[PDB]
Symmetry: C6
């Protein structure tokens, strides 16, 4: 990553490397993996981002879908930012330089610490996150339409399932509630907060 | 977070990230989670606070109740602090900027390290804590009225249950004691400290 | 805590937070918990001390006895140090400011780094330790009078039990020894060191 | 490694040492070991690279194949960069100096921090990585031609196996799919992305 | 401890605290605990040394024997260094100040960072180590005279037991060897190294 | 160790201490322990080297063989570097000073940070490593002549055993291969690389 000493390059830590590999191993593509990715890659260069993605051993279908989204984003970058070199001067990054496949670490550092910065790390991160969100959505196993409260399922447990599903996938809460709770919730009227719904079906 | 070097931004550490996720996994919304949240988010920016909340994988009913409390606090902020920009100048934060959904990290840093500081991290933290306290109270499973000393339950064990319940929920200690201990405690008279009660029913 | 860079404030570390919670979980109020508390709270502000106490999830009988001892110490402080403010000047701490319930972190820092310092962290720590020692003594399960050497119990094992009990609770060693060892120890005469006693009953 | 303070030498950390040994123990020569090697050896001197390789206890067939590839790369270096010393001056590195077998740590440091640098650490790392890629390929147990979708195997599971194999080893995806999915995929037409294939056989 | 920034005081780390408690829990008073104690207390003040000793929960017979040895060493210090104060000046340490029971942390720091230093931490450490060596010797369960090679016990295993015993306790190696190995060893003649003995009875 | 701030002394870390003790516990004197020793003792003083050796609890036969090799190396040092003191001047180290048994930490530091340095830490380390290599060789359980490929043993598994043995101990690879693989390997002709042998007997 690049952090403050000046803005300097630091090696990615074993701690970070291991945190990410273990998140992926334990959580696969549950939606909460994405903010963890984002936070573990704070200050990442593109080289660091590729490290993190490359150190994942399974899920190679997902990793190939990700390469696809990256190549689409990189093609769109190049459409909007065609590149035209001057000895000792900073060249303009192309999509593949942002994605770290045709740029050196030194180039990456030169862009990211330029004044003003060309934040290649943050641009690449957004393309990766875009890819990862597609993957989360792909691997979401259940439609929110199939999350319905069981006859002895506590409302709270049902709400947990409901919003967990909506998170991966992205009135009905009441519609999908069991008969007894639905009756209570209908009687609460419109404008009830979630808190008030949950208290009423407790 | 922002800490002293100057007040500088530092990446959230894997240690912190993992500590918080593991607290939530092991303790759910026992009341002791709140001071742990507070201490793990020392110096947090709003971006860091969202990271911590976003990395929680379960409990999405609670996470949605929290969003509600945040949006109420943010609406009250905006009622009290309407915003009116000057090139290169610091804009005034709105509720959604404090909550980190419409402000950049750079803006956040600019507010929090301003002289005088606009402590958006601490303001957001208070809204989050307000939400989390509601959640603790919601998930408290037992009324203090139902904590009563068993006939062979050691007084100390009963007192532990009593104050654990009162903590989640927020004379009777004596009223709820078993017959034998209640007699002893009545004889102690008013003004007995807890220490003296516990020694008397040992 | 406040440590040297100047004396600066630093966030409490996840390491410290977790160490303390795990000590309490594994050791409850064995006497060795107290020096561990003391060492983990090195440089603590009152806010940090409250963090550490607040992050404990069980033992709420003990935590309430502790609040009592704190309020007594704070009432005695106020009796000895009544407080009489000048714009931009440092106010004098009251008991509740020392205990961190009515003082801000900034006030705490201002007292503790004043020249000369008003060491609110160290004063509060002593009140806490006073409370914790009462708790250790309360939860000590056995009178030293009931620690007696078993007929086949190795002397060393008996001495361990004896001094472990005396530590929680706070001639007889010989009196409480078994017949065979007592005879040997009586023959050693007065002035024997513990080492010499232990060697004689080996 | 050499990192920024100046570019200074730092001892390899126990954390790094243990991370690498544990990667190798758990993952052997799965392809994801290589980027982990690369990232754990960030800033490595040749001495550090030899440390990391030497601390591996098993896999000595692989370690000897690696020595072979290193000696070939070192022989090619010497062919392209023959060496011709001046008291107190920096000598030119030979292959065996790059590989750290005939150079001291001090020499290594002198090359790597020279202006301009003679990046012996990065040159050696590339030879090692070249060797490790041969080893990954050797130990790849399955031809991509033998990865075929089972009749009840979910497409996603089959794609994972397919790209995992291709990664170790380095139209057919459709050819190797089961009859039912192959029919769907043929109907999608050419130019389908992987995402669209995976959605169609879901 | 006191370490270099100036010589400054630093809080004892949770890492150190936990390392020591775990050594004692796992190893009791095997002789190898002593060098670990020494290395974990590098730069320790007397306050730190007391912390480390006080955080041990079991072994209170040993801890009381240690207090005895400390009080003897402290009495001998006072015999050799009687103390005779000048406002704002450094007083001379007595035994009990060296052992940290009557000296403050500030006094300790003032002695240890004086020019020239009065190394109270190192003096106390030597008294502690003296005590701990007595304890190691006390708890050594076996005389070296009872370590004899079994008829099918590998020589190496026997030598391990022999020198392990001698270490706790502090020609015969040959005398205590089994008949077959003793014959071989007698034939080797005098002046054989241990290496040569071990090779001969392999 | 001594590392860069100036070259300053730093305490050995609990991390290092524990890493070494655990390596020895898990790996005994497999050859890979030696490079781990070397890397964990980077910058070690002789005092640190003795710490590391002294903290090992088992293997006291090996530890005594090591003392022997050290005393031989130290006797050879003294033969080549006899010592002839000037108030406030640096004395010349004898073998026993290099091995840290008759030199103080301060002396050690004075030698190692002298300009030019008298690298007592590196000299002692080489004597230790010399000893440890003898120990590795002693405890190597099998002659390379007894490593022969089983009739259903995969060639790769056999090569692993072969080079693992050669490493502890320090044409035949083909001679010791099973009949079927030996035939293939004979047909490959001379000059085959290990890679080509392994591919041919796959
Ligand atoms: C002793 C022991 C530790 N662990 C883990 C628990 C801990 N997880 N986290 N932290 C690790 C210790 O690594 P940790 O102390 O976190 O080291 P690091 O992350 O490098 O931080 P620093 O060195 O303090 O700067 O080992 C275990 O799983 N089982 C065990 O028996």
């Amino acid at each position: 990553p690049i952090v403050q000493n000046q803005m300097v390059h630091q090696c990615i830590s074993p701690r970070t490397l291991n945190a990410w590999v273990k998140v992926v191993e334990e959580k696969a593509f549950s939606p909460e993996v994405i903010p963890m990715f984002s936070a573990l890659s704070c200050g990442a260069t593109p080289q660091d981002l590729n490290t993190m993605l490359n150190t994942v051993g399974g899920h190679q279908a997902a990793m190939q879908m990700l390469k696809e989204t990256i190549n689409e984003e990189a093609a769109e970058w190049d459409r909007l930012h065609p590149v035209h070199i001057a000895p000792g001067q900073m060249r303009e990054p192309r999509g593949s330089d942002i994605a770290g496949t045709t740029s050196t670490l030194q180039e990456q550092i030169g862009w990211m610490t330029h004044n003003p910065p060309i934040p290649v790390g943050e641009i690449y991160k957004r393309w990766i996150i875009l890819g990862l969100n597609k993957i989360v959505r792909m691997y979401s196993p259940t439609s929110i339409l199939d999350i319905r409260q069981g006859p002895k399922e506590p409302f709270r447990d049902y709400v947990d399932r409901f919003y967990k599903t909506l998170r991966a996938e992205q009135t009905l809460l009441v519609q999908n509630a069991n008969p007894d709770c639905k009756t209570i919730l209908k009687a609460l009227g419109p404008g009830a907060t979630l808190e008030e719904m949950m208290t009423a079906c407790q």
